[PDB]
PDB file of C-alpha atoms in Angstrom:
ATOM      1  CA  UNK A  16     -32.317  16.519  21.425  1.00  0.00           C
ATOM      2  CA  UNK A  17     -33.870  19.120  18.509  1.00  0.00           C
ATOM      3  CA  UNK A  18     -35.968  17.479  15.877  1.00  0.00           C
ATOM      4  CA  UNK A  19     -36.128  18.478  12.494  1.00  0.00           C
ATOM      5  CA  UNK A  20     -39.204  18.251  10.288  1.00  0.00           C
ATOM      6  CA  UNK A  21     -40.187  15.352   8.391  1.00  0.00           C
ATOM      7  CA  UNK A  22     -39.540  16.850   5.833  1.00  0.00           C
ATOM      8  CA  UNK A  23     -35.785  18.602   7.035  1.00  0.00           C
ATOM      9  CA  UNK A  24     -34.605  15.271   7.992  1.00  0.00           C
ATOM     10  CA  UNK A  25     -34.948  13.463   4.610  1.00  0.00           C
ATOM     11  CA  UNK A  26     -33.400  16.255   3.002  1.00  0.00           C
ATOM     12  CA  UNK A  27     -30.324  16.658   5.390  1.00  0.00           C
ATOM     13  CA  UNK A  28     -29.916  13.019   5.811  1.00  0.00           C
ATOM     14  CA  UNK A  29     -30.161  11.879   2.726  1.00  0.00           C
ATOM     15  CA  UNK A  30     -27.197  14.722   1.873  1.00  0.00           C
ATOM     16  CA  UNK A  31     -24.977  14.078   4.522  1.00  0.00           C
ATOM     17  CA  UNK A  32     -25.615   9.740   3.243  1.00  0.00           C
ATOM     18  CA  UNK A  33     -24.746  11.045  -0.072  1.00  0.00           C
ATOM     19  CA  UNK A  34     -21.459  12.921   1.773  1.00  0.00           C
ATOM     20  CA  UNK A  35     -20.103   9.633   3.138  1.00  0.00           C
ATOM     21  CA  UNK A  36     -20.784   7.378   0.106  1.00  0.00           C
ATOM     22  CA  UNK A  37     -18.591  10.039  -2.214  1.00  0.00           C
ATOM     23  CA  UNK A  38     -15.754   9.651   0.520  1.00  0.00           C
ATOM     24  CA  UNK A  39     -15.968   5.510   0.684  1.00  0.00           C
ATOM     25  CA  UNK A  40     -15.738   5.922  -3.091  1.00  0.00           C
ATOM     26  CA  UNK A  41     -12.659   8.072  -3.140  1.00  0.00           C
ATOM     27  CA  UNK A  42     -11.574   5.305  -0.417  1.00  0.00           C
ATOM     28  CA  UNK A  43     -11.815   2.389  -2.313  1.00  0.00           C
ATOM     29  CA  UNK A  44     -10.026   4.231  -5.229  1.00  0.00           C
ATOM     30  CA  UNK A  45      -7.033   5.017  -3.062  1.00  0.00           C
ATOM     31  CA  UNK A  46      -6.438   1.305  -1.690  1.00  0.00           C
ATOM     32  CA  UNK A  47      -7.320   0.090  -5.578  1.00  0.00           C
ATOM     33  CA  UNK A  48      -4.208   2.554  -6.190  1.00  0.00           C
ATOM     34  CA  UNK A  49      -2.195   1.569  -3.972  1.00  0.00           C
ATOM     35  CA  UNK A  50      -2.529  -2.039  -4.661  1.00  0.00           C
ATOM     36  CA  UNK A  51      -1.221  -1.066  -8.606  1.00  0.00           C
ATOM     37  CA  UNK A  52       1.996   0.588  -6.964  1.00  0.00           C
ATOM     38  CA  UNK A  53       2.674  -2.432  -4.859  1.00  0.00           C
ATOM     39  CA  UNK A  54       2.553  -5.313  -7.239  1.00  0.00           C
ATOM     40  CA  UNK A  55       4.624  -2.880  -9.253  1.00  0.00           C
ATOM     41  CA  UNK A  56       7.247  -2.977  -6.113  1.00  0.00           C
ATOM     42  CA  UNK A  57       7.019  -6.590  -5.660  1.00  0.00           C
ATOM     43  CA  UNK A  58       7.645  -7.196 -10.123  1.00  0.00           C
ATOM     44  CA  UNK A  59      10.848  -4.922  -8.771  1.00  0.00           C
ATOM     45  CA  UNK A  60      11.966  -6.794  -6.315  1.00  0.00           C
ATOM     46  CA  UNK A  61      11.566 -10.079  -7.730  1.00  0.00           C
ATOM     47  CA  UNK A  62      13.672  -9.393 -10.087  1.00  0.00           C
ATOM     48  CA  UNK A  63      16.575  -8.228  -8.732  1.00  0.00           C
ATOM     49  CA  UNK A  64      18.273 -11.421  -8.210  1.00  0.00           C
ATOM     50  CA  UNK A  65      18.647 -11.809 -11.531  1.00  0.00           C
ATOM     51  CA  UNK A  66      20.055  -8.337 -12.149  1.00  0.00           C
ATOM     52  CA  UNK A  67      23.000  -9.014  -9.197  1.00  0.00           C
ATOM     53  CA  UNK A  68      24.385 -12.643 -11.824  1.00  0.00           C
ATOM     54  CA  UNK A  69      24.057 -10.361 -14.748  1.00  0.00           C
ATOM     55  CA  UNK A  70      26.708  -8.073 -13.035  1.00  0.00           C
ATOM     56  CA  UNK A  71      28.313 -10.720 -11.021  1.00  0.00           C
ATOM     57  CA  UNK A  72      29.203 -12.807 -14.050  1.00  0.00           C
ATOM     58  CA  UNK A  73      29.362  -9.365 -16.321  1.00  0.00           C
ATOM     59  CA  UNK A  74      32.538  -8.739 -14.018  1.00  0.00           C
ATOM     60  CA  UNK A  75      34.911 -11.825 -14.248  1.00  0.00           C
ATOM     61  CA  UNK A  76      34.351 -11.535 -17.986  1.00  0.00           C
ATOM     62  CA  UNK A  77      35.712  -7.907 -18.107  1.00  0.00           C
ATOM     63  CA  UNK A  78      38.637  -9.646 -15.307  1.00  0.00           C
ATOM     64  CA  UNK A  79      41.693 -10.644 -17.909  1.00  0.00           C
ATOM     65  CA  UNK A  80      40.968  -7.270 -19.707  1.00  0.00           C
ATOM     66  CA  UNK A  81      41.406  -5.444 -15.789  1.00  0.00           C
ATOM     67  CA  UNK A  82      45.159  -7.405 -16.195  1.00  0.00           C
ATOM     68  CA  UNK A  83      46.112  -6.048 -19.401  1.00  0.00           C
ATOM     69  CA  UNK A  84      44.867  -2.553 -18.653  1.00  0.00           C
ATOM     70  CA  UNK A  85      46.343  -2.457 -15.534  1.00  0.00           C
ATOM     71  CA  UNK A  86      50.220  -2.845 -16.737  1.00  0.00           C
TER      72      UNK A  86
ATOM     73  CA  UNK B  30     -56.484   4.529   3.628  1.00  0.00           C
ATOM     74  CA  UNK B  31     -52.753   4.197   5.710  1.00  0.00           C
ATOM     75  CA  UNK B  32     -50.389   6.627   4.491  1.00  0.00           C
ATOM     76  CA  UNK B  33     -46.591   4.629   3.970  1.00  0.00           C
ATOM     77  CA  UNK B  34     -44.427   7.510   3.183  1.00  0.00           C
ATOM     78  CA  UNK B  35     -42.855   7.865   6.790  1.00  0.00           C
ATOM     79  CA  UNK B  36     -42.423   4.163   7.429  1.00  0.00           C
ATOM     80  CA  UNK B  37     -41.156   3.485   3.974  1.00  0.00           C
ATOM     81  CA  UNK B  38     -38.121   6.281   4.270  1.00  0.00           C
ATOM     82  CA  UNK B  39     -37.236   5.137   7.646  1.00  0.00           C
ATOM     83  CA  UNK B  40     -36.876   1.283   6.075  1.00  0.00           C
ATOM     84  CA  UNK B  41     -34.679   3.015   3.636  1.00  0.00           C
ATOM     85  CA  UNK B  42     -32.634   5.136   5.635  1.00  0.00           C
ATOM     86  CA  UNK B  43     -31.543   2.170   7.740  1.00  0.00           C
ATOM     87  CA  UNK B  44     -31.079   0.235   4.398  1.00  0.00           C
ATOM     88  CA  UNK B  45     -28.915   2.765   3.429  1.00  0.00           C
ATOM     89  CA  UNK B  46     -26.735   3.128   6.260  1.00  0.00           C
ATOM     90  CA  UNK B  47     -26.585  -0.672   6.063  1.00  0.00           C
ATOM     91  CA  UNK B  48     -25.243  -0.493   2.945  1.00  0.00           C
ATOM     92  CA  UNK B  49     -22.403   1.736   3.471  1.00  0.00           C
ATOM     93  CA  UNK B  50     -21.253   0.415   6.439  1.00  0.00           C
ATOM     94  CA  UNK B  51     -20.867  -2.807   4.764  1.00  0.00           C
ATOM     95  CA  UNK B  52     -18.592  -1.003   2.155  1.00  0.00           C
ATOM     96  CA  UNK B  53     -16.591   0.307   5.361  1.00  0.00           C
ATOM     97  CA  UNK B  54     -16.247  -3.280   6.391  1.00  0.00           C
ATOM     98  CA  UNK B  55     -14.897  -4.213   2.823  1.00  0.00           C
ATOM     99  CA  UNK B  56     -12.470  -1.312   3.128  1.00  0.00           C
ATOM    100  CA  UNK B  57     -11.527  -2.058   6.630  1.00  0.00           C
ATOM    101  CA  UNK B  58     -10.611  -5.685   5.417  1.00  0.00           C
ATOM    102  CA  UNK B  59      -8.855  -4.445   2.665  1.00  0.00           C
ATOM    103  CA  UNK B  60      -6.753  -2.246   4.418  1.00  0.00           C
ATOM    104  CA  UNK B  61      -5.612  -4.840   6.540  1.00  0.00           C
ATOM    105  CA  UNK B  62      -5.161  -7.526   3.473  1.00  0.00           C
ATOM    106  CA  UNK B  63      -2.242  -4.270   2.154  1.00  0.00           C
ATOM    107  CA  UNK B  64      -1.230  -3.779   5.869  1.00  0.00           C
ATOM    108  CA  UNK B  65      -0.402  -7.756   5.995  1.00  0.00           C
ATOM    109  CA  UNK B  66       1.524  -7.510   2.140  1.00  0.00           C
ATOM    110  CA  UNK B  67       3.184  -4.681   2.747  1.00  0.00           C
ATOM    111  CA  UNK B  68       4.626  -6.053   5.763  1.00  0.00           C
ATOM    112  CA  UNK B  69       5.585  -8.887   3.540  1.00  0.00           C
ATOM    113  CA  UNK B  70       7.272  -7.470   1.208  1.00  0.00           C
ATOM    114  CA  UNK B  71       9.087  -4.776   3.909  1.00  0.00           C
ATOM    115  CA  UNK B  72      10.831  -8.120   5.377  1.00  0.00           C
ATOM    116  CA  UNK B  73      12.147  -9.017   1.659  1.00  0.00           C
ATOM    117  CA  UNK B  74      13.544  -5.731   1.249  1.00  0.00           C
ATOM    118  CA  UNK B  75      15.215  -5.896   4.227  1.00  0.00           C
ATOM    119  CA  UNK B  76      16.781  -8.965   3.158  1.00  0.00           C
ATOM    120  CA  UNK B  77      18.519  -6.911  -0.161  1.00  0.00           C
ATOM    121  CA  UNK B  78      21.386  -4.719   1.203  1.00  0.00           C
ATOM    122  CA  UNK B  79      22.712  -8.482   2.429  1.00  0.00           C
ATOM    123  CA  UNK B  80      22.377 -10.039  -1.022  1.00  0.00           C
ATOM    124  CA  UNK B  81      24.463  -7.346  -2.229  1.00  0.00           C
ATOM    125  CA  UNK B  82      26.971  -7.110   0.027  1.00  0.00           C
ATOM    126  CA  UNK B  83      27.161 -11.302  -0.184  1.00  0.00           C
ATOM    127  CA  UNK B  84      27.263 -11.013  -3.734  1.00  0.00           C
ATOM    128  CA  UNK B  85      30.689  -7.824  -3.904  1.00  0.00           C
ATOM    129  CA  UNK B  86      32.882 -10.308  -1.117  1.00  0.00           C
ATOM    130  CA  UNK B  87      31.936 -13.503  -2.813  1.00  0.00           C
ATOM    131  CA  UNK B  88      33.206 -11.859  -6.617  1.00  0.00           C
ATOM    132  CA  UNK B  89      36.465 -10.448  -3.983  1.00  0.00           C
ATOM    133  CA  UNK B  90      37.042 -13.828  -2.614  1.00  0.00           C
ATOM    134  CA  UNK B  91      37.405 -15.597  -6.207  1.00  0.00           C
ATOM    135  CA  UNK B  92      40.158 -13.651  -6.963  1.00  0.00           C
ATOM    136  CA  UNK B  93      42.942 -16.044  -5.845  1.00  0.00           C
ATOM    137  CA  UNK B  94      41.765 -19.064  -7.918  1.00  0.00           C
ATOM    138  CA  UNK B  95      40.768 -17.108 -10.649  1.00  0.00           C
ATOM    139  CA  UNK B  96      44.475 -15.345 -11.542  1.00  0.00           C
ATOM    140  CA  UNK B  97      46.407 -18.108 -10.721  1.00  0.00           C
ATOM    141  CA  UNK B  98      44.693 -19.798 -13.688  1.00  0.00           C
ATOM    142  CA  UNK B  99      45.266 -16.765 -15.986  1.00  0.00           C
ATOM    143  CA  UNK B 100      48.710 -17.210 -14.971  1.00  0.00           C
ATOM    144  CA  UNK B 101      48.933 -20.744 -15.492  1.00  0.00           C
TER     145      UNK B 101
ATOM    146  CA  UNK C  25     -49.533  12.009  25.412  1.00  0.00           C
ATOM    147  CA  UNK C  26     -46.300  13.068  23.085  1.00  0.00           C
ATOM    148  CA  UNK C  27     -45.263  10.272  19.970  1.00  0.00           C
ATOM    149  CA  UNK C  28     -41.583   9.943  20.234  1.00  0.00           C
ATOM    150  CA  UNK C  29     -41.199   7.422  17.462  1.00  0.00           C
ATOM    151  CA  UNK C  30     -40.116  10.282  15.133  1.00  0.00           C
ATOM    152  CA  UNK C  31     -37.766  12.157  17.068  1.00  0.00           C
ATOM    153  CA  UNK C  32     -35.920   8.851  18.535  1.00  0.00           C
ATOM    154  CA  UNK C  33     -35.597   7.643  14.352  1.00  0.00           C
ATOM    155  CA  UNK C  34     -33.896  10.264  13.976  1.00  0.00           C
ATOM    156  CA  UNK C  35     -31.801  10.878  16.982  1.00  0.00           C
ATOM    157  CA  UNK C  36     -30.802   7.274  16.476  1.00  0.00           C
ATOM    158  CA  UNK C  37     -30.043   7.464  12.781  1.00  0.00           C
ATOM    159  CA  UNK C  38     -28.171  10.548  13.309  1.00  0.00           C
ATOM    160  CA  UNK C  39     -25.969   8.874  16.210  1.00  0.00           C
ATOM    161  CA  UNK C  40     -25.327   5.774  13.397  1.00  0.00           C
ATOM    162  CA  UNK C  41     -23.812   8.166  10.526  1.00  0.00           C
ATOM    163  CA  UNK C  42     -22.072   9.517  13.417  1.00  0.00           C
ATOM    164  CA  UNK C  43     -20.319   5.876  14.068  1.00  0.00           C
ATOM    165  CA  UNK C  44     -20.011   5.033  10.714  1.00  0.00           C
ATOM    166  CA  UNK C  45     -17.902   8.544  10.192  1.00  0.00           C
ATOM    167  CA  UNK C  46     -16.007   7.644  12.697  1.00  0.00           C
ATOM    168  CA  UNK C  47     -14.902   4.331  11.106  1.00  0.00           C
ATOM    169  CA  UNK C  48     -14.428   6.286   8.005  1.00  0.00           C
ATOM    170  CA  UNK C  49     -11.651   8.845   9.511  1.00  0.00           C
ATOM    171  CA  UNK C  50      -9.653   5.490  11.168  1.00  0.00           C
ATOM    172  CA  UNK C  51      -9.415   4.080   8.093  1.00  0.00           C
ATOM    173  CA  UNK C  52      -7.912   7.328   6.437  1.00  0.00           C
ATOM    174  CA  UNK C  53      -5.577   7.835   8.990  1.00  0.00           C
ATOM    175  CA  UNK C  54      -4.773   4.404   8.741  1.00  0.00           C
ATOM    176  CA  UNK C  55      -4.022   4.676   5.005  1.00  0.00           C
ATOM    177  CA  UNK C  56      -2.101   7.873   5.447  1.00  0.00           C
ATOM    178  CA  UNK C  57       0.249   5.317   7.531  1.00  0.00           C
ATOM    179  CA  UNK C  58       0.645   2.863   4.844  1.00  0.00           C
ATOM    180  CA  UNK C  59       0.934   4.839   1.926  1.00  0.00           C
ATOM    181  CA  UNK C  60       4.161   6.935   3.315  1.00  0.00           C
ATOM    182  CA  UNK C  61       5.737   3.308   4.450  1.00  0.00           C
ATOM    183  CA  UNK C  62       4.589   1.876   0.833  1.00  0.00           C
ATOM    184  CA  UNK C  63       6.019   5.293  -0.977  1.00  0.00           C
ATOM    185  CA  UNK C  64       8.983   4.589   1.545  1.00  0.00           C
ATOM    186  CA  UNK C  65       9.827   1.235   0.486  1.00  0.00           C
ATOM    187  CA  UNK C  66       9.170   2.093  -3.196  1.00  0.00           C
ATOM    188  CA  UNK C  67      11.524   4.505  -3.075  1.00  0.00           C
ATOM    189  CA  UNK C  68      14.511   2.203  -1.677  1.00  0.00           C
ATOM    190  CA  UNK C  69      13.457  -0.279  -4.187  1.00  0.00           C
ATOM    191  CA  UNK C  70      14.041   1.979  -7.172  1.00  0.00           C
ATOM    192  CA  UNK C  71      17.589   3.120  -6.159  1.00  0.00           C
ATOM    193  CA  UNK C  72      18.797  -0.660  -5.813  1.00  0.00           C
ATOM    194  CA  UNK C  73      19.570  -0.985  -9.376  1.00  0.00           C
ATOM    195  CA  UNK C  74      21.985   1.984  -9.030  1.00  0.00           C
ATOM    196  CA  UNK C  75      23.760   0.284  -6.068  1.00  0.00           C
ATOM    197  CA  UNK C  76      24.097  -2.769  -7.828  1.00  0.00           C
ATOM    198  CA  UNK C  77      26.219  -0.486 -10.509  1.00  0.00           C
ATOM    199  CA  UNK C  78      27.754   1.218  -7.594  1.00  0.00           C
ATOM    200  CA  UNK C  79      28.787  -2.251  -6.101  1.00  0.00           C
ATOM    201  CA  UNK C  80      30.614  -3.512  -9.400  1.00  0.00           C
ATOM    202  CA  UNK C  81      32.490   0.064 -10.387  1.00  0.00           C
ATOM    203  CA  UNK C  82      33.941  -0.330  -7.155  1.00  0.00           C
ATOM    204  CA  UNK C  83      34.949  -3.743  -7.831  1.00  0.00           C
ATOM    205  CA  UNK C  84      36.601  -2.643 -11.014  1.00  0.00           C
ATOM    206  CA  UNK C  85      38.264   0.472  -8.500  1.00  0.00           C
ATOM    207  CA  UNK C  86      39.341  -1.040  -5.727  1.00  0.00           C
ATOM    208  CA  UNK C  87      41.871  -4.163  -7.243  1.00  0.00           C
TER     209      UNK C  87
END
């Protein structure tokens, strides 16, 4: 093993800390992100149950008018 | 007279790598928390193509009743 | 008689950035993972509302 300076070593290590701590940052930003899109996903999801009645019952309300049209 | 320099940078070095590998260990259980929601919510979606499918026969199978009354 | 308390500090703290690096490029890779499935599922989820059109024009087609 090669040892640096007293001096050399608190510079380079204190760099390559600084190194990490700007990636963790850029880390935690990414999985903050990412939680945002998937609450967005889940408001989605939730409500598409009441998107399938609107067009369920949007259907047999257009049904005597599919009748008349048809003939 | 004791010099403290040297002593006091390695207490703060090890500090310091202390500290971020405690924010890796927040991240690490974070990543995990989305892992387990994710999955979650994967199983829901997988769920959907039924609840439309149940939904277009179930409209097709109310057909019988329903023009029989316009009929009537 | 060589001091070594130097020269093992800093072998040691270099080996212990090393590990905590290490954790650092499993958790990207990890997170690559996940955001593809998460963009994935996103992507299904935003089409639905079009299927649920698609399923009642073909309703009003196919009687």
């Amino acid at each position: 093993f090669k040892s640096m300076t007293q001096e050399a070593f608190q510079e380079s290590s204190v760099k390559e800390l600084g190194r990490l701590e700007a990636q963790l940052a850029s880390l935690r930003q990414e999985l903050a992100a990412l939680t945002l899109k998937q609450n967005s996903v889940a408001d989605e999801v939730g409500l598409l149950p009441q998107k399938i009645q609107a067009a369920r019952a949007d259907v047999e309300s257009q049904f005597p008018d599919w009748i008349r049209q048809f003939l």
